[PDB]
From a paper:
Glutamine synthetase (GS) is an ancient enzyme that catalyzes the ATP-dependent condensation of glutamate and ammonia to glutamine. Here, we demonstrate that human glutamine synthetase (GS) can reversibly polymerize into filaments aided by a composite binding site formed at the filament interface by the product, glutamine. The glutamate/ammonia binding site is gated by a flexible loop that bears two key catalytic residues: R299, which interacts with glutamate substrate carboxyl group, and E305, which is predicted to deprotonate ammonium ions to ammonia, enabling the required nucleophilic attack of the y-glutamyl phosphate intermediate.
To test the model that loop biasing impacts KM values for GS, we structurally characterized the decameric form of loop variant R298A under turnover conditions. Importantly, this map, despite being the highest global resolution map reconstructed, did not display any appreciable E305-loop density, similar to the turnover filament. We observe multiple residue contacts that appear stabilizing including a hydrophobic pocket formed by L300, I285, and I309, a salt-bridge formed between R298 and D239, and a hydrogen bond between H304 and N249. The KM, glutamate for R298A and L300A are outside the normal steady state concentrations of intracellular glutamate, suggesting that loop conformational control of the Michaelis-complex can occur in the cell to directly impact metabolic flux through GS.
Numbering used by the authors:
A (entry chain A): 1 to 373
B (entry chain B), C (entry chain E), D (entry chain F), E (entry chain G): 2 to 373
């Protein structure tokens, strides 16, 4: 009732079948983002030998009508591999492949932002920007309520669940442990995890990652989480407000730095970037939402350790400010700063592109520059 | 619900199966029954591991129990045709696909591999290749699709095609196990994907040369059935498993020859399609085990399907009867896809009809007796 | 009843955990929260395996979520103090016990290890050793002891102490797993036994020198909680887990020094006890996390306990406040046991109080401020 | 799915309710709380059966517990306004609807009957009539519509509207009990029917004059809540209880005066419609219980719902804001229908707004403080 | 969960109870336990229906089994004091409340009616009136409030007070049955209402004169217990049934005399309040069955409760120890409220203390021995 029917099949049988030696053929799983801008799709292929780099993989295609990314006769779409990882659900030599999507006429799809993001990162390469993001999520049963919660009721009040240990403090640690190990095996740049303010709510961190690798790593981590939860029979949701009422919301803070900031006395560069950021609050708010600003309003309300969407604010060691400069970097006059505005279901390509445009290209206005800068 | 057998303790079975086997070898004989759609099997012991299919001995079975014979002369003969590694018992055990003959050594009514191989031997120098996409639906023991709400329906279509997640894909364990088992056995499996409604999947076979296509597809079907039996669910190839607005199942066939695969083979592809355009009724009859009934189940003109009453072709047209992939159009060489055959088709008959229509230039509404 | 998490097919988790993991290393930071009894943890990734606790980096956490801070200056600091092998993830992963400091680098209110180590450093030449017996009861998620009849009671006391059998011992799996995990991690675990009421157990730690006792006990408690979480039950250190005639839970402490261990140390033991006899109220206050409210619930004469307001000593008297084992008395050397501390005590405070009273000749109603 | 209270043995309750009660009489008071949508009740004993609402005494309740007052002066008084027979306890016990007042005798924030009554009295000579159609949905305690498959959906729309059969109508027992209870109580129920989705129903409150419309509708809502409590389910008036392609909820209100009812009243109906055409925003604000912030979820230009920002009217048109029944149009006399109000509206405010705009010729964006 | 007895078939019992009785009648005796807050009962057959309580004979019971006697002289006698009709077995059967006496005819320790009656008789000239409000909570047999989620909590406070609906009021059947049974029996049941948390309720025992107040309250408690026994649940008068941010339980007592009820009685009300303001500790001790140890958990400044040691009074103040209703203040007539007593108080003790302090103005720390 709380978990899916698939999860009640005998898994020893599956393990027995998966123990069989594979042979010479190699399995590859293609992954891409769909038309909703936040869903993922996948399908499997057979190769004659193990590819040594992403350049050796061939292109593929899929039917766009059933994905809501095309209509009419010209429904075929193209898949172009972008990044490759080791497959933790199968094992070596099988692979996972993240792909970009293009229309029949070879133009990028509406939900394909990696193209422009890669362009901008190539433009600003020399400054070595690094990114780190903290993804929050809630584990849910198949009945629409959070996993492990009382049937038609609520747990005790908040306070004992943040970083808690015990059968009555943390729900669903098996998924978390499995996800951690799977990401490490695949090669995702996972940096840590912790339990959140309300039980069945968790978080994992990614990075620091340079340039375009941040988005690839985050998306692959999301796919791995979904697949693991599917194995266990529960649902993982990135919704900014999973449960109504007093209970905690969900967000995705972003950490950003450059070589100048990481060098000695980089605090001046950090402050300059903060000042530049202060002028583009509405633009960045619009960027951070996949739907144009609907979810940002739902998240940013001033509660559950989140700032208020009304106005931009910054400070040192201020958890409630829009921008946070940690005390350690403040004391050492170097390091990084954290942006706490982006919502849990954000798009890393958009977030990173907006940050680069605002801070390093000195862009201004309400629209991005078309060709260059 | 799942079967009662699936609720027995499988650790016990694993304990027994882990015992060293010894010197004897098990072989499982497989054949097609009188309905033209079902499969049957039984096991025997051999003194040593065979090295090729020619070393296996002939066998027999009682035809009255499979509705393939009547009267006193009910004995039927099994003749091995192709051999594979057994994924349910591991080396050195084998799976054997056999042809069926009557007591007087004539082919059985449902034995089409005889004529299919006869025809294939005629055009060997042209190296025809085939590839087929088998769709199926996973069903519970109660007659409803696996994982669906009890006496209800899941959400509308759109999020299930190639989906990932507990609420978007049902029964991936069966799919993964089937993939691995086919790879171990040596079936030429090429890929898989989830389909438009949940609990519906597809796997692809090929490219396969000549007669090997039918053998490979039939063995893949048998392996799927055995795996589902292990898990306690039912796999159905019915063209319309669930009534109403939901998606139907089919089996697309891809076909090419050496000339088509050579540079500027698009001309040959076009001539083959032109020839195909004049035998629509014949091919429709060939694609159905019953003889022209199951075709109307899927060719209703909905959810990317062509109307059964008319023939059509195109490059990117998913809804056309014949499809030439866009990449094949851009590069003047490759293959083309036929979308008419139903999910419960017979590969021997399908491939024989394609060869007859395209390479032998046959005409009329009946096959040529001996010369073609 | 057991938790919902405990029904999630642990075979899947084992499959995932059997992966090689490559070159990165996981570290779990552990610390004590604002209630003075709870524990909290979170994980971090390191580039290589640390060889000693000195090369681990500092960290921080949000104090507002653990009631240890308020206002804007809610950031707190974590400073590693002791390192152990991780039994839940195996080598090369680690567990790290940390001290807590405020934003201004002052120790937190619940951070007693600072002063405890300060005091212990003044007596190092005397080599004090400690050993503590932790009791606990296993409880279901519904608030009743694990394995007890639903809304009922088991038979009366007598057959459960050190018992064996399905009807005499409840939950030995947790005990065995905890024992093995502590041995693997390197905790100085000395033994275990079942207690007077079913589902009630005890484990012993030591002998431990100086400050290591407190961290060993705390890490043992954390490991117990994690194991119970795996099995889906709750472990409680509450001094009176169930109302009525059933026995409470204590944390008897054993103490000795080099002089007592040496020949004819019984005289030193007697002087230490005579000194302890004059600070009953001070030690009672020290032994309780909340200032002395929980201890009154246990010391009532029953369950082999002494009166709360009366100090007494003896050799074989288990009902006295201080106990000198008979073998120690006969051999004129060894140790003595203090039976006052409650099950939810803080070892840092307990050991600090013992040291200050016995070896520093401290007197008065409050501890010495600066030194000694 | 159903509440724990509904699983108790109802035969025990019935045997208790069969006792003859004697000379005393029970009276249940009902009032509207601070949210403006919820209802509260409690009971007091009376010495003899009252024969007129004027005979019932005043009472009071704690306003701080219903979010209607704060501080020391939290007492609130309620004044009975209407009386009905009690269908749950039978004669001579009674139901009483009351108005709320602050510690100083001023109406509470959610007391709209006070002004509605004055507005009705200053127009009584024209004898306005009202008729309202309340839609609602039955929900289980788990949060899903009653009788729906767990985590799934029933078939598409089309068979449920005014349906009959186990697979087409869910929970008709509640509807029957409510209808009979209303008839016994004296509330004006005019009819009922099953709506476009299963577990969704509708009941009309017959033609009432002036202020009695709101009283009857509020008492009907209370009786529905009480009956659903007996059965173990929840009745919700949410305009959009289930997102997706599933029908929503509203409460249409029909209006008529003596002039319209008389011969050639169609011209007066047209005049009223023309007057209403210029107060769209004001009426939209008045019809939503919380200042025009919830009805937008339903009015979206689909499912025969007109655009929220666009006003339209027509004859026999169910897609317009205002509809003139075809029979009324043909007879040149009758009434007209307003389709804008949602399911959770306040009838007092709705009727007051209609009177103000159509009969008192008010034009401003705020109510006129003394008549018009 | 509910008791096993409540799952038996109640139709069988009803069939049996339908049998005509005959000439004999049953009488059920009731008396207060040795704990001072428990009730016991048993039944004897009588030849004829008694007309008045004076016709009932004396009886006895084993005091050693109720923990109010010891040794050989364990017999105890009970003397009937009040009689009512029996609602569980209809007319002519009866139930009788009795006083307890020792073997030597000295009143038992928990017999307070003996002295309460003397005080009331000595002060009868002024005709004191009393009214009390009993709060209680319905518990399942597993130890949690009835209808609460297993191991969880309902939503926060606010919707349950005087609530209606399946999700807002739990177990109204018990309340209805108890109300009707009390009315049939003949006790004053003045009214009822749902309380701040679900499964918590209140009933008020109407204006009684003299010891009749205590008699009626005790009989009402007995009736509640028997009805809850029929339904399978437990009723608890614990001051703090559920710890945390959840409402407690008290027993408010309203007092008045003829002078207070007469015109310009507010002066006497103020005089009585002033007299009470000096015996706060004495009244706190008297309002607790144990001697002033249980009400502490209730009075903490929360739930609108008064301070434990700071007496206060006011008009329309819920937070004060004594409150004067606003209507009483405005009319200069009526009564005043004492909000100190907890749920498990003894009405005889409460009324006796009020009489002693207010009417004959005692001042000592102990009750006066002779006629005071
Ligand atoms: N120099 C840097 N530049 C950018 N990001 C960094 C840098 N150093 C660390 N980070 C990132 O900061 C993140 C810290 O996240 P976390 O400690 O969970 O945030 P918080 O303390 O606000 O909860 C890590 O994911 C890490 O990748
Ligand atoms: N040269 C060829 N001749 C015949 N078949 C081919 C050739 N190349 C590929 N195929 C087959 O075409 C099939 C395409 O499968 P799939 O991608 O599932 O269908 P679609 O692209 O129509 O969705 C594969 O199974 C493959 O075996
Ligand atoms: N010389 C010593 N100094 C301090 N502690 C000691 C010494 N020798 C043994 N101990 C401790 O005494 C404890 C004995 O506990 P246990 O036998 O369970 O107590 P009991 O016999 O009272 O049940 C062990 O945990 C051990 O570490
Ligand atoms: N003369 C009238 N004045 C006011 N209301 C009327 C008059 N005649 C009928 N009605 C109301 O019209 C409503 C018709 O309800 P119903 O038939 O369910 O709606 P519909 O006609 O849209 O299907 C009834 O509630 C009834 O009270
Ligand atoms: N003249 C009076 N003398 C004594 N008691 C009275 C008098 N009038 C009313 N009461 C009592 O006051 C109580 C009022 O109870 P209730 O209204 O439930 O609580 P509250 O007054 O706090 O709202 C009743 O129990 C009733 O018996
Ligand atoms: Mg973080
Ligand atoms: Mg952060
Ligand atoms: Mg395909
Ligand atoms: Mg295809
Ligand atoms: Mg011991
Ligand atoms: Mg001991
Ligand atoms: Mg209608
Ligand atoms: Mg209508
Ligand atoms: Mg009251
Ligand atoms: Mg009161």
């Amino acid at each position: 009732m709380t978990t899916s029917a698939s999860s009640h099949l005998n898994k020893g049988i599956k393990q027995v079948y998966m123990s069989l030696p594979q042979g010479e053929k190699v399995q590859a799983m293609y992954i891409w983002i769909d038309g909703t801008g936040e869903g993922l799709r996948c399908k499997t292929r057979t190769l004659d030998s193990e590819p040594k780099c992403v350049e050796e993989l061939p292109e593929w295609n899929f039917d766009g009508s059933s994905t809501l990314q095309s209509e009419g006769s010209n429904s075929d779409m193209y898949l172009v591999p972008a990044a490759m990882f080791r497959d933790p659900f199968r094992k070596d030599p099988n692979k996972l492949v993240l792909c970009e999507v293009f229309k029949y006429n070879r133009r990028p799809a509406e939900t394909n932002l990696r193209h422009t993001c890669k362009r901008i990162m190539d433009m600003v390469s020399n400054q070595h920007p690094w990114f780190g993001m903290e993804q929050e999520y809630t584990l849910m049963g198949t009945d629409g309520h959070p996993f492990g919660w009382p049937s038609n009721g609520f747990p005790g009040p908040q306070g004992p669940y943040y970083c808690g240990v015990g059968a009555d403090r943390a729900y669903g640690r098996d998924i978390v442990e499995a996800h951690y190990r799977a990401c490490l095996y695949a090669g995702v740049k996972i940096a840590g995890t912790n339990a959140e303010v309300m039980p069945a709510q968790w978080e994992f961190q990614i990075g620091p990652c340079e340039g375009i690798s941040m988005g690839d790593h985050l998306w692959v981590a999301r796919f791995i989480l979904h697949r693991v939860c599917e194995d266990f029979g529960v649902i993982a949701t990135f919704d900014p407000k999973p449960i109504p009422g007093n209970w905690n919301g969900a967000g995705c803070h972003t950490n950003f730095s450059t070589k100048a900031m990481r060098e000695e006395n980089g605090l001046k560069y950090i402050e300059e970037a903060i000042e530049k950021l202060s002028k583009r609050h509405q633009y960045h708010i619009r960027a951070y939402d996949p739907k144009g600003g609907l979810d940002n309003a739902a998240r940013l309300t001033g509660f559950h350790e989140t700032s208020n969407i009304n106005d931009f604010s910054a400070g040192v060691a201020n958890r409630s400010a829009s921008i946070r400069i940690p005390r350690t970097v403040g004391q050492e006059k170097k390091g990084y700063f954290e942006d706490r505005r982006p919502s849990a279901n954000c798009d890393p390509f958009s977030v990173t592109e907006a940050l680069i445009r605002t801070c390093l290209l000195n862009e201004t206005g309400d629209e991005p520059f078309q060709y260059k800068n």
